[PDB]
Every structure is written in structure tokens, then in C-alpha cells.
């Protein structure tokens, strides 16, 4: 009843102001944190989100669940972007970054309702975060005896905990051994495009395998592929970027002929153009032909008579992996074919895995790439297995360049609460209610390890705060037994930069929510 002007404010916009705006932003982050709350820990469940088209996507990753909720709240989009940056920087910090940033707002939620101008909270959050990321670097263990069997065992323990809380229960010793062997075959770039993860429907998780070479899906061929048998003991691969069809036209050629004696010479020349390209592939040992451009019926029957195999319409992502596997080079022009541009393998067969055919390469010792073939019972089952595989790969990718690891579980998150509560009792002012509130907010990572399976989480935090204040600093939460356990001796490991980027992204997100005091939304939504 108050605002009735002749000319309105902007158009029709509503804007909240002050203290009711800030509690509206904190309580909005609590609702979106419930979609990643039950996905923490090995006893954490997954979630299924269906869109309007009917496509079902079952996952437990924070970067997968939060992107499918279609959240339109302005403050709640901050917790989605830190789950996207954790997947882009680390790859396995996802559900922990979103839930810890919501606790930084809920611990100051009784403090923002009673005074406490938020510049003191931003200064206290940046002070506690810099001390938290420094105590991790001063306690992260490392070794000086690398390039041995001990360094490979360090990469396997970080991949088993990365494969934890996924849809893998007893296949931790089988899958994580293949993840470490996948990145050691790569070069010194650690590119994720140099490893193919292809899903084949049909088969259990034990039927999966890590191919040392490459394997493509055997796309649409022509008449002549029931010939050309798949038994090669030492073949050569001709990677091409040319068309092997009779109708290869430059789309601007007009062959004006004058007589019938020269008219037949043009048609004989069009076959002689295609057959000259096939003679360049021949007489060089290249029994296997690969090209991203299609091959017609003429060149398919020519290779069947000369006992040669071909494969057309190969995707460009597969030919780049095939080039690094066999050690050759993709030649667009067939005139420059030699022994230096062809590939070399040992076993090249076309199997029948999952009903569909797959042409797999194996036996090449100079393989700078690999291919991990997944076999599952559903399309959404293999998509979760692919999403769980990317989290284990990106952990062991960062662990090579930085081998400093910390203890898994809630071992680091509890001892950082010890060093911050001892720091808060040595400084005067209003920071005792904010540094200590930052330390109590870090204790939810051992809470969600217990609240997902009961475990009497109130009594298990009194044992964690007593063990870290008395003895070791790597005591966490045991999952099989309902007690505290040393996670460093139980081989529950994780890299140190997983928790460094988790504390950095959660603090910068929590400092952004407390810094906005007005929210203006324009009604034009077309």
C-alpha cells in the first residue's frame, strides 16, 4: 500500500534488503546441500534425477547431481559452481566442497541474525582458510624413493579411496590396478583424450579389461566385410584421411566431352584414379586400412581379393588414439606412403564382446595410450561406471606431479579443527566466535561418514577429539567397524591438493554469500 508513484522504480522488480536477505541466502544453500548430503562416505547412497524428456541419470557425484537439479536461485548457484570447479581442478572434490560450504553459512547463521556486520566474517574466513591450507602442506607425508614399486603402491591406495563411495564394492582391487596402469602408459602431458572409455552393454564388472592398444566400435560398413579375416600376427596400419569411393568429386568439375572415343576415356580414368590410390596402399605391407572418410563398394572388394582389411568412417577421436598406439602418422595423401608412416602391432582381431563387434589392437610395446572397455548390465550402469572411472583417473593424474598425500576419511578435517580451536583461544576480539565456528564446521565430514549408517555419531566425535588431542593426527572413522581407526595405517589415502582446493573453494563461496546484501530480479523472462 506504500509505493504508489506515477512512474515506478524500474519496471516491477522486487528486492529484499538487509538481515532477512542474508538468512534467505543461507537457508537456500541448506536445501541444495541435501542433494549431496546422502552421497558422502562408503555407506552413502546414490540419487536418480529425471528430466522433462524422460532421460534417467543415476549418480552420486556432486558435479553430476547439482547440474541436473536446474536450480534458479541466485545464492544457491554458488554451490553448484564450486562443484564444477572441483571436478575441473581435482576431479574428486565434489560432494565434500558443496556440503562444507553450506556448514560455513549454517555455523554463522545464528551470528548473522544478531548484528555482526559481514566484513568481520569475511576477514575471519580468509584468516582460518590460509592457516588450514598451510597445516595440510606441513603434515602431508611424502617419499624420497620414487620410480620404484613403492611409488606404484602409493598410486593404488589413492585410487581405491577415489573408487570408494561409487558403484563398486568388491572390484576395488581390480579396477584401481587398471587406473594406475592406464596413466603410466601415457606420456608426460597426462591428457585425458589419450584414453578411451567405451561402454559395451552386457557382462559383469569382472568382464571389463584394459586394452594396451585401441579399439573402435566397428561402424557402418559395406558389402565385403564378411570376408577379410581378422587373423594378423604382425600387421601394418595405414591411417588415412582420404575417400576410397568412386564418386570422389570436387563439386566444381564439368567434364565437357566432344566425341564418344574420348567419352569412354573419362569413365576409364575415373576408375584409374581410384585404383591408383589402392595400389599406393598395396605393395607396402599395410594389411589394415583405417580412414575417417567413407570407403565405397569398389575399394572394399579390392581389399577382400588382396586379403587386406579396411575400416571406414572411423571417428577422429579414435584415430588420434590409434596414431599414438601404433606409433604411425595419419596420411591424407596416399602418394607419400612409406615404412615410416605405417603402424605396427601384434594381435589385431575383431571380437564379439557384448554382441557388437570391436576391432581391438594389442601387442605394441611403444604404446603411449590405452583403452578401458567397460562392460555392464545397463546404459545408466556403465555411465556411472564411466563417471566413477573419471574420478579415479583424475586423482591419480594429479598424484604423479604431486605425491604429497594425507589421510582419508575425517582424519584431516578433525585435526584441522584442533589446530584452529587452539588458535582461536590465543587471539582476542570477536574472532573467537568465528575461528572456533570455522573449526566446528569442519567436523561434518566425519559426521556424514557416520550419519549415513547410524554409528552413534555423537559418541564417535568425542573419541576423535580425544585421540587427536593426545596421540596421532591421522585417526579417522572406520567404515567396517563402528570405532575410530588410524586411516594412515589402514591405507585410506588421498592427495593433499584434494583438500586444499576443497577448503579454498568452500571459503570463497561462503565469503560470496555473506557479502551480497541486495538481490534485484527483473521480471522480463522471455
Amino acid at each position: 500500500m506504500m509505493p504508489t508513484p506515477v512512474i515506478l522504480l524500474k519496471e516491477g522488480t522486487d528486492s529484499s534488503q538487509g538481515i532477512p536477505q542474508l538468512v534467505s541466502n543461507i537457508s537456500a544453500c541448506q536445501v541444495i546441500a541435501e542433494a549431496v548430503r546422502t552421497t558422502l562416505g562408503p555407506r552413502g547412497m546414490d540419487k536418480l534425477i529425471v528430466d522433462g524428456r524422460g532421460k534417467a541419470t543415476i549418480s552420486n557425484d556432486g558435479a553430476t547431481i547439482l547440474k541436473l537439479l536446474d536450480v534458479v536461485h541466485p545464492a544457491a548457484k554458488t554451490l553448484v559452481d564450486i562443484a564444477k570447479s572441483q571436478d575441473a581442478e581435482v576431479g574428486d572434490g565434489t560432494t565434500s566442497v558443496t556440503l562444507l560450504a553450506a556448514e560455513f553459512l549454517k555455523q554463522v547463521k545464528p551470528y548473522v541474525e544478531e548484528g555482526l556486520h559481514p566484513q568481520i566474517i569475511i576477514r575471519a574466513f580468509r584468516t582460518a582458510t590460509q592457516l588450514a591450507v598451510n597445516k595440510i602442506k606441513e603434515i602431508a607425508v611424502t617419499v624420497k624413493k620414487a620410480d620404484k614399486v613403492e611409488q606404484r603402491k602409493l598410486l593404488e591406495k589413492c585410487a581405491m579411496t577415489a573408487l570408494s563411495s561409487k558403484l563398486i564394492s568388491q572390484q576395488k582391487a581390480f579396477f584401481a590396478k587398471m587406473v594406475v596402469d592406464a596413466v603410466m602408459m601415457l606420456d608426460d602431458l597426462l591428457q585425458l583424450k589419450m584414453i578411451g572409455i567405451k561402454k559395451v552393454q552386457g557382462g559383469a564388472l569382472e568382464d571389463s579389461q584394459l586394452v594396451a592398444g585401441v579399439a573402435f566400435k566397428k561402424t557402418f560398413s559395406y558389402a565385403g566385410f564378411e570376408m577379410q579375416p581378422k587373423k594378423y600376427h604382425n600387421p601394418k596400419i595405414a591411417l588415412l584421411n582420404v575417400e576410397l569411393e568412386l564418386k570422389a568429386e570436387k563439386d566444381n568439375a564439368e567434364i565437357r566431352v566432344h566425341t564418344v572415343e574420348d567419352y569412354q576415356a573419362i569413365v576409364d580414368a575415373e576408375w584409374n584414379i581410384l585404383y591408383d590410390k589402392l595400389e599406393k596402399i598395396h605393395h607396402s605391407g599395410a594389411k589394415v586400412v583405417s580412414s575417417k572418410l567413407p570407403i565405397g563398394d569398389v575399394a572394399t572388394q579390392y581389399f577382400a581379393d588382396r586379403d587386406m582389411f579396411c575400416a571406414g568412417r572411423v571417428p577422429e577421436e579414435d584415430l588420434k588414439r590409434t596414431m599414438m598406439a601404433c606409433g604411425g602418422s595419419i596420411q591424407t595423401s596416399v602418394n607419400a606412403l612409406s615404412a615410416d608412416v605405417l603402424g605396427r602391432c601384434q594381435v589385431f582381431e575383431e571380437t564379439q564382446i557384448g554382441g557388437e563387434r570391436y576391432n581391438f589392437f594389442t601387442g605394441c610395446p611403444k604404446a603411449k595410450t590405452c583403452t578401458f572397455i567397460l562392460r555392464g548390465g545397463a546404459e545408466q550402469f556403465m555411465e556411472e561406471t564411466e563417471r566413477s572411472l573419471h574420478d579415479a583417473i583424475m586423482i591419480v593424474r594429479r598424484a604423479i606431479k604431486n605425491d604429497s598425500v594425507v589421510a582419508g576419511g575425517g582424519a584431516i578435517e578433525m585435526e584441522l579443527s584442533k589446530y584452529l580451536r587452539d588458535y582461536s583461544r590465543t587471539i582476542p576480539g570477536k574472532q573467537q566466535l568465528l575461528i572456533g565456528a570455522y573449526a566446528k564446521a569442519l567436523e561434518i565430514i566425519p559426521r556424514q561418514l557416520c550419519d549415513n549408517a547410524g554409528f552413534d555419531a555423537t559418541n564417535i566425535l568425542n573419541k576423535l577429539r580425544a585421540r587427536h588431542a593426545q596421540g596421532g593426527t591421522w585417526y579417522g572413522v572406520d567404515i567396517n567397524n563402528e570405532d575410530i581407526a588410524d586411516n594412515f595405517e589402514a591405507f585410506v589415502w588421498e592427495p593433499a591438493m584434494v583438500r586444499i582446493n576443497a577448503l579454498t573453494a568452500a571459503s570463497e563461496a561462503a565469503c560470496l554469500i555473506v557479502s551480497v546484501d541486495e538481490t534485484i530480479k527483473n521480471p522480463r523472462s522471455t
Binding site: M1, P20, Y111, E114, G115, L116, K430, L433, R447, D451, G454, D456, A457, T458
Partner: protein, 537 residues
């Protein structure tokens, strides 16, 4: 498979989070109207009526609610008026913060029955500590206790002036209606004070009428409107023409007997009016009706007759003036006796000018010397606010004179209970110590709300508040820091013993008992089923 109910079912922590937001929706409204720095609100209806008030009972009664957990806190404010009368913004904020801190406990997988049993050990200990840490009864301070307790209630309302004008009128009103009872009970019925409203001069012209102020008119404009040494005749029967009942009918067989029956309806009527007027009665009060034929007998004899008065107003006049409420004829088969020795007495019955209305005043009533307060304000919105603020001020001095015990206000009780219950939770606390520890943090919201509405320092003034109360409990050197409160006009902890910030004991004892009991019922809504409205079938 599932339940085939036609309504709606929600289980788990959904209703456990909805009841806290339902209680916080009510507490965030009334948080801006607490303490001397509190501000009033506006209650606009759909028909156009505007109600400006700041009391916790008048706001929540007119406000419509839908949630079942919201109706508990709204009916909690209605009980505070009957039991205490000023304690009806502070109960709603405590009972909602009791659910906010208990919601943080049940999210830690703590069972709510331990929180219910933990709240009962902290509520009974809070009444035990407040009854052993009072300062003094009403013997040492005397009249200074009644004035300082009255000014604490008026500080949150429109009558919170720096002077003692409204404070002295309330104490002189309760002290003039001292009605003794059996077994030594000096009762003070505050409902007998007729609080009247009139849009007139400023608030400094509020008259304290020693007697009673009747809100009625004389009627016929031929009666003397001022009678000195008046004799009040309180009676409840309509002074109209004698109408026969349903069982009696007039069936005449002779035309000569027609006019004698018609004149008999007024002769029996005027026979009562001549025997109640020959006994010296000058003022006649009637709850029924005096028609135009009977008004002539008061103009001719020179008597005042007031018709259609309230039944609740006639009992306050007849008890204060020594009059007997007579309904009919009586006294052992007597024709017309009226018991003329039982007439009321009054010094002066005068109809004054009350800014374009008529108001009848009775001066000192010669028997009991009652009191009535006529309020004066700018508009009708201030007069409705001045009536609610005066009625809450009358209930404060009623409980102090009945229960001679006062506690320091301004957050001094909630600061001492916030530290005693933390030490109480450490002694006998094994599994319910977390509920007693959150009972102390929920009580701290009363000094926290005083710092928000005053725009002062929040996390430093209350931290300095409990610094004095901690030294008064762990350092037994007679520090006498149990009366440390808040100075909201300066922003520093002050001593409420010398400053005169006094509150009754049962304004916080009954507040902590009603808020703890209301927090138990809302803590047991883990399952909630809502059926569809059955309106059109």
C-alpha cells in the same frame, strides 16, 4: 502398496524442519517489538480497519495462521494475558528458539526424548535458581518498587515518557481497589478499573477519576446533570409500561371495564417509580430500559436517571458505593418496600465534557473509594494502543503486590541462567547435558534481541553482559553482580538495582514454564498427516 489416504503424508526431517520455520516465522515478526527500543506495527484488515499495536498478544490474535505448529505459539501468547498479563512478547521468542536449538540436536542423531527430558531438568532448575537469587521483597523499597516496575512495562509502548505521570496513575489505581478476602488474601482485581478512551488533548491530560466513570448519557434533556450529595439507586429491571406475559391475556366482556385496564398499565408502572424516588434517591442506574413516559417523573422531581448501562459496570458501582443490586420486589411478601436503607452514596455525580460526547463521573463513592482512568490521545489508533499498554501496566503492579518478589529486568535473569545451567549440565550430565547446554543458549536470545533493536553492538555487549554474571558465580567475594543488565540508550552493562529496572518474578517463571511446555509438543511432530478439506463433498 502405500497408504491409501486421500490427504497428504510427510515423514522424516521434512516436518522437523517445517515446524522450526513455522515458529521462526512468528518470532521474526515480534522480534522488532521487544524492549524499550522496540517499535510498534500496523495491522490492516481487508475491510480497512487499522490497528497499531506492539503487544505480543494483540498481534498474533488478529494475524491469520495456517500451520499447526504456528497455532501453538499464537495460543501461547493468549495464555500469558490471563495468567500474567505482560509477558507476551518474550514467551514467543524463547519458545521458538527452544525449537531452533533442539532442531540442531536432532540433526546430530540425538533422540528428542533426551531433549525433552533435558529441557525439564533445565526448566525446573531455572525456577529453583530464580527463587533463591532474588534481591528483596516489597518492604525495603516501598513505593519505589511499584513505580519502577510500572515504568519497565511502559518502556516498550507509547506511554514510555521520561517522567512519572503514567507510572503514578497506575500505582494509585491498584492501591485504591484493595479488596480483602478470607484467610488473609489482599486481592487486587484490576478488571474493575474502567479504562475509557476519548480523542482529546495530549497524554499529559489523562484524568485519574477517583471513583467510577460511567460511559453513558442522561437521556432526557430536562434532568439536572450535576447532583451533589447523590444517592445512587442501582437496579436491573426495565422501567417501561406493564406488559403482560404470554400466559396472561386480557379478555374483557364489558365495554365499561376497558379504560380502567388501559390506565392500569401505567399506574402500576408509576407506582414503582414513586416509591424508589420518595426515599431520597437522586441517581438511578438501569441495565434495562426507561421509556419516554417514565422519564417525566425524574424531570418533575429533579432526579437523574441513566438507562441501558452495562451489567459489568453496575456491579462495579454498587460494590464501590454500597448500593444493593435489586431486580424486583422482595422482603417477605411485601407490596412495595424497596429496602430504602440499602441505597448507594456518592459525593458528586457530574456529567462533564469529553470532547463532543457525554460522560458521567462519580466522585469517591463514599464507601470504597474506587478508581477509573480516562485516557486522552490524538486519534483512535493511539487510544486503542493506550488502552492495551495501560492494561498490561495494571497487571504488573497486581503481581508485585500479590507476590512480593521482583527480579531485575533487561536481560539480567537470562544472563545469570545462561551460566548457571552450563555448570549444572557438567555436574549431572551424561547424555542429556547437550539439551541443558542448548537451553542456556536459547535463553540468551532475550538480551540478544535488545541489542539488535537498539542498533548497538551485538556480540560484544552480551559478551560483556555475561562477563559480570560469570564472576558473580565463580568468585564468591560478594561482587553483587547478579543485577547486571543492559543500558540500551548508552550501550553498556548497567546495574538494574539502582537504575530501577524491575520485573515481577512470575513474568519470567511462568514464561519459562509455558515456553518449555510448548516446545515439547512441537518437538513430537516427526510424522504429520494432512487431510484434504471437506467443503463441497
Amino acid at each position: 502398496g502405500p497408504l491409501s489416504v486421500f490427504g497428504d503424508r510427510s515423514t522424516g526431517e521434512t516436518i522437523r524442519s517445517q515446524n522450526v520455520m513455522a515458529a521462526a516465522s512468528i518470532a521474526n515478526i515480534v522480534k522488532s517489538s521487544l524492549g524499550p527500543v522496540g517499535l510498534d506495527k500496523m495491522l490492516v484488515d481487508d475491510i480497512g480497519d487499522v490497528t497499531i499495536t506492539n503487544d505480543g498478544a494483540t498481534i498474533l490474535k488478529l494475524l491469520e495462521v495456517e500451520h499447526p505448529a504456528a497455532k501453538v505459539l499464537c495460543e501461547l501468547a493468549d495464555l500469558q494475558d490471563k495468567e500474567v498479563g505482560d509477558g507476551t512478547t518474550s514467551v514467543v521468542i524463547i519458545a521458538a528458539e527452544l525449537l531452533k536449538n533442539a532442531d540442531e540436536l536432532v540433526k546430530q542423531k540425538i533422540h528428542p526424548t533426551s531433549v525433552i527430558s533435558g529441557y525439564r531438568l533445565a526448566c525446573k532448575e531455572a525456577v529453583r535458581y530464580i527463587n533463591e537469587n532474588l534481591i528483596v521483597n516489597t518492604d525495603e523499597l516501598g513505593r519505589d518498587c511499584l513505580i519502577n516496575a510500572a515504568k519497565t512495562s511502559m518502556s516498550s509502548k507509547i506511554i514510555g515518557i521520561n517522567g512519572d505521570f503514567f507510572a503514578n496513575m497506575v500505582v494509585d489505581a491498584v492501591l485504591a481497589i484493595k479488596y480483602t478476602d478470607i484467610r488473609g488474601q489482599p486481592r487486587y482485581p484490576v478488571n474493575s478499573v474502567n479504562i475509557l478512551k476519548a480523542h482529546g488533548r495530549s497524554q499529559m491530560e489523562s484524568m485519574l477519576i477517583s471513583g467510577y466513570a460511567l460511559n453513558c448519557v442522561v437521556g432526557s434533556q430536562g434532568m439536572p446533570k450535576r447532583i451533589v450529595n447523590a444517592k445512587i439507586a442501582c437496579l436491573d429491571f426495565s422501567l417501561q409500561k406493564t406488559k403482560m406475559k404470554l400466559g396472561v391475556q386480557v379478555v374483557i366482556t364489558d365495554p365499561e371495564k376497558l379504560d380502567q385496564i388501559r390506565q392500569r398499565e401505567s399506574d402500576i408502572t408509576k407506582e414503582r417509580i414513586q416509591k424508589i424516588l420518595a426515599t431520597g434517591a437522586n441517581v438511578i442506574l438501569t441495565t434495562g430500559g426507561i421509556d419516554d413516559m417514565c422519564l417525566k417523573y425524574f424531570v418533575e422531581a429533579g432526579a437523574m436517571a441513566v438507562r441501558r448501562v452495562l451489567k459489568r459496570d453496575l456491579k462495579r458501582i454498587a460494590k464501590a458505593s454500597g448500593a444493593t443490586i435489586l431486580s424486583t420486589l422482595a422482603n417477605l411478601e411485601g407490596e412495595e418496600t424497596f429496602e430504602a436503607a440499602m441505597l448507594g452514596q456518592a459525593e458528586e455525580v457530574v456529567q462533564e465534557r469529553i470532547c463532543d460526547d457525554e460522560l458521567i463521573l462519580i466522585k469517591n463513592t463514599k464507601a470504597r473509594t474506587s478508581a477509573s482512568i480516562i485516557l486522552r490521545g490524538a486519534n483512535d489508533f493511539m487510544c486503542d494502543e493506550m488502552e492495551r499498554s495501560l492494561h498490561d501496566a495494571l497487571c504488573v503492579v497486581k503481581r508485585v503486590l500479590e507476590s512480593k518478589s521482583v527480579v531485575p529486568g533487561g536481560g539480567a535473569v537470562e544472563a545469570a541462567l545462561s551460566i548457571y545451567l552450563e555448570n549444572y549440565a557438567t555436574s549431572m550430565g551424561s547424555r542429556e547435558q547437550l539439551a541443558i547446554a542448548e537451553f542456556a543458549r536459547s535463553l540468551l536470545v532475550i538480551p540478544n534481541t535488545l541489542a539488535v533493536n537498539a542498533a548497538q553492538d551485538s556480540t560484544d555487549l552480551v559478551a560483556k553482559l555475561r562477563a559480570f554474571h560469570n564472576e558473580a558465580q565463580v568468585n564468591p567475594e560478594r561482587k553483587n553482580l547478579k543485577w547486571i543488565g543492559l543500558d540500551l540508550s548508552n550501550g553498556k552493562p548497567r546495574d538494574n538495582k539502582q537504575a530501577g529496572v524491575f520485573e515481577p518474578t512470575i513474568v519470567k517463571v511462568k514464561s519459562l514454564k509455558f515456553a518449555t511446555e510448548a516446545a515439547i509438543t512441537i518437538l513430537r511432530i516427526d510424522d504429520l498427516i494432512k487431510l484434504h478439506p471437506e467443503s463441497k463433498d
